[PDB]
Structures are given as C-alpha cells and as structure tokens.
C-alpha cells in the first residue's frame, strides 16, 4: 500500500481513527476554517457567522498563550477525576469524538484553570525582568 503524507487528506479526515494518528492531520482542518436580494441577506448572514465562529476559538487560544501554536504544552496538571484511562489506551484505542464526549462535563473547569494559570505566568515573569 502506497503512503499518504496526511497533507493530501480531505476535510474531517481521520475522524474515525485513533487520537494519536489524528494528531498528525491538524493542518487540513485549519485551512477550511474561514474558507438587496433574498440570497444576499442569507449569504451575508453566513459570512458573519463564519467570522464569529472562527474568532471565538482564537480568543480562547490567545488567553491560554497558544496564540499561534497549533500544539502547545501547559503547566496545569491533569486530574485523574476528569479521566482515569492510561496514556497507552487513550492515544491508540479510541477516536477524538469519543474522548470529547467523555470529558464534556469538565470542560468548564479546565477552561478557567488555563486562564488562571497563564495569567499567573505573566505577573511573576514581569517581576523577574524588574531586577535589572
């Protein structure tokens, strides 16, 4: 079987594959984002809707410090209550759709922690540069 570089795959591809495998196809999804008459009003409503949805994700990314980084590590640790499965069975035994459904209840708590942590990363850094 000849190999595909994963850059040639289409939109929403590798959705049914493992999380680890799908982590190599993040680029293709990002490209498709932001792709007088009765039709004009509906078309105009569509354009603003696309802008609003794209900007919502970017606003969260900026606060978390991943303004432009596609994959970014953070300092907050993972809690076993949110997920109890081992690393081997997460990246190689289920898809991304199942993972998000599992942890959909704890998304609010995690989001707030990233803002609090990243905000703390800024004030202490500022204190360090004031010693010159």
């Amino acid at each position, epitope marked *: *079987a*000849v*190999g*595909i570089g994963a850059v040639f*795959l289409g939109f929403l591809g590798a959705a049914g594959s493992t999380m680890g495998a799908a982590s190599n196809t993040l680029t293709v999804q990002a490209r498709q984002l932001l792709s007088l008459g009765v039709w004009g009003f509906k078309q105009l409503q569509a354009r603003v809707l696309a802008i609003e949805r794209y900007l919502e994700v970017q606003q969260l990314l900026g606060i978390w410090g991943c303004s432009g980084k596609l994959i970014c590590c953070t300092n907050v640790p993972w809690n076993s209550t949110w997920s109890n499965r081992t690393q081997e069975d997460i990246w190689n035994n289920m898809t991304w759709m199942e993972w998000e459904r599992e942890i959909g209840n704890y998304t609010h708590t995690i989001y707030s922690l990233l803002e609090e942590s990243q905000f703390q990363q800024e004030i202490n850094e500022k204190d360090l540069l004031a010693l010159d």
Partner: nanobody
Framework: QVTLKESGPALVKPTQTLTLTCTFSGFSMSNFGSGIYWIRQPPGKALEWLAG???????YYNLSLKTRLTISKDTSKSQVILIMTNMDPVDTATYYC??????????????????????WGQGVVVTVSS
C-alpha cells in the same frame, strides 16, 4: 459518470517518440482518490501494466520500462499525456487508460491501497510496421 477516451497514431515507426493522451471528464485529478492507469495487451495474451499517476503528483512506473516511460498530467486541458521512446516490434498492442477506485487506512502512517480499476477506456491500437 466518468468517460475515458484515448487517442494516438496507429502506424508508429521504430526508434522515434510517440505520445498517448487520455481525455477524462466528470472528475478532477487533484481531488482525493483520483488516479489513472495505463494497461497494455498484445493480441491474444494477458494484460501488462505500464505506469500510473495519482492526485498526489506521484508517478509510478514498471521496473522493466522505467527509463522508457515518462507520464504527465494537464489540469487546464484536463488530460494525461504518456510519452514512450525507443519502441520495438513487440510493442504492437492495445493501449488502455482506466480510472481507479481505492481505500485509505492508517498503519504507522496513512496508506492508500487500490480495491480495483473500475472505469476503463475503449482502447487504441498501435502497430510497429512500415
């Protein structure tokens, strides 16, 4: 619906350069899963695979005729051009251009395997004589 039509001269002299062109419609050669093959069949015997070109701009040729074969595609004219050089008397055969259908799966990297060549052409006859 996909239609494959090929064209080329029948009387071909030896040692020169010949051009085969297969015209396609109903699909694009840049989309996922696109690909066109080249099959040969001298009269009364089995088929032979010349080469193939995928939508990834990847060209695959037979080992025995690697140097003699070079394939190309045309996005504007919507055609694929095959060039062969230094023919032989055994080159007398029918040339087929066909479209492939395939599958994709992940095994230490995404892989593409063909399930079978679905849409074939009508065929064009080439002869080596004088």
């Amino acid at each position: 619906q996909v239609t494959l039509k090929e064209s080329g001269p029948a009387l071909v002299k030896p040692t020169q350069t010949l051009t085969l062109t297969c015209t396609f419609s109903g699909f694009s050669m840049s989309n996922f899963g696109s690909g066109i093959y080249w099959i040969r069949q001298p009269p009364g015997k089995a088929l032979e695979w010349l080469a193939g070109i995928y939508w990834t701009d990847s060209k695959y040729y037979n080992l025995s005729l690697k140097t003699r074969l070079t394939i190309s595609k045309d996005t504007s004219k919507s055609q694929v051009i095959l060039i062969m050089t230094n023919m032989d008397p055994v080159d007398t055969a029918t040339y087929y251009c066909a479209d492939i259908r395939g599958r994709y799966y992940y095994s230490n990297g995404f892989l593409f395997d063909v399930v079978g060549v679905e849409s074939w052409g009508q065929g064009v006859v080439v002869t080596v004589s004088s």
